[PDB]
Design a protein around this ligand. Sequence first.
Ligand SMILES: CN(C)c1cc(-c2ccncc2)c(-c2ccccc2)nn1
Ligand SMILES: Fc1ccc(-c2n[nH]cc2-c2ccncc2)cc1
Ligand SMILES: [Zn+2]
Length: 339
Amino acid sequence: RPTFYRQELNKTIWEVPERYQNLSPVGSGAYGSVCAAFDTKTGLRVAVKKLSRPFQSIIHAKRTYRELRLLKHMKHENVIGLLDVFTPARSLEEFNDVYLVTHLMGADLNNIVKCQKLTDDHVQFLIYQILRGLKYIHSADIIHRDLKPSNLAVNEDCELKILEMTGYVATRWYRAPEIMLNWMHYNQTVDIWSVGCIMAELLTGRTLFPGTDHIDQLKLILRLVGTPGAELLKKISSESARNYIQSLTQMPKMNFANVFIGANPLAVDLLEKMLVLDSDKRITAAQALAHAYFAQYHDPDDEPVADPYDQSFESRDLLIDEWKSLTYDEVISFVPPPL
Ligand SMILES: CN(C)c1cc(-c2ccncc2)c(-c2ccccc2)nn1
Ligand SMILES: Fc1ccc(-c2n[nH]cc2-c2ccncc2)cc1
Ligand SMILES: [Zn+2]
């Protein structure tokens, strides 16, 4: 066991091992507080996230276990991975706080899209890295469900990695329409829709669907992609949604070459395959990587898939003490990756 030292940053106390020095607050939120630090053992700049109230509720305890299980499993250049995980507690009885450590990423895609207008070559590299990480995530039968610019970390090298009422976001401009319709059988291609919205934002500099609420969000989406056709209509079970979409004003599918003027016709062709209403016909991450848009980056031998990921815990109804004990087991059993 290492030696821990204590200090108070902002209004939160931090008890981290001695190997992490020069702790500096970089961000905060519902998830928890993140501090930049220097790791003296490896010489790397790392990010240390202290989870907030990790076991205040069953929702918190299970989400703490889920995040730790996910981060321990992701080993991919374009997905955030665990360099270390620790707790200052010496036993299960005192187990109260959880700290996670990864490589320090300086900014996100929002701090880049607003500060500059990305060239087409930068859009290719950034979207390729997202899809390369999405193929890995999706190969483990994992759906991100919340892909957005603020969840995409980027450093100076333009290297990219994918990252109750608390943390409520009113409208998600990047959410697939099938989720906005509260469809329960949405698939992995909900993430591909978000990539299309992100890629459109990088090409134009504007939010593609900046809706004000869930109803306004659907109206903005339907104005571009058109109202559902007959094949899609046959798949809507909720009469409330089927009658709503039929009662609405019939909008035709717009010409994407007219919407995204001056853009690379290869990029427009990809956007047409990503921003498809019917999720059955949406391009997948693996298919998108082979698109001619990424001809200079695509390498079929260098786009790996993930090891099988056991999600059986997601259907379990355990107690807070059980999720807590399961999380403690994952903390101790953690082995770091080779330097
Ligand atoms: C919600 N959000 C923006 C983030 C950012 C980061 C982050 C990652 C890398 N560098 C800087 C910040 C983290 C994080 C996750 C695990 C360990 C440490 C930090 N979690 N959430
Ligand atoms: F307006 C829309 C927006 C999205 C969809 C949709 N695309 N893929 C699946 C669905 C869907 C939505 C609701 N219920 C079943 C299926 C259908 C109509
Ligand atoms: Zn909560």
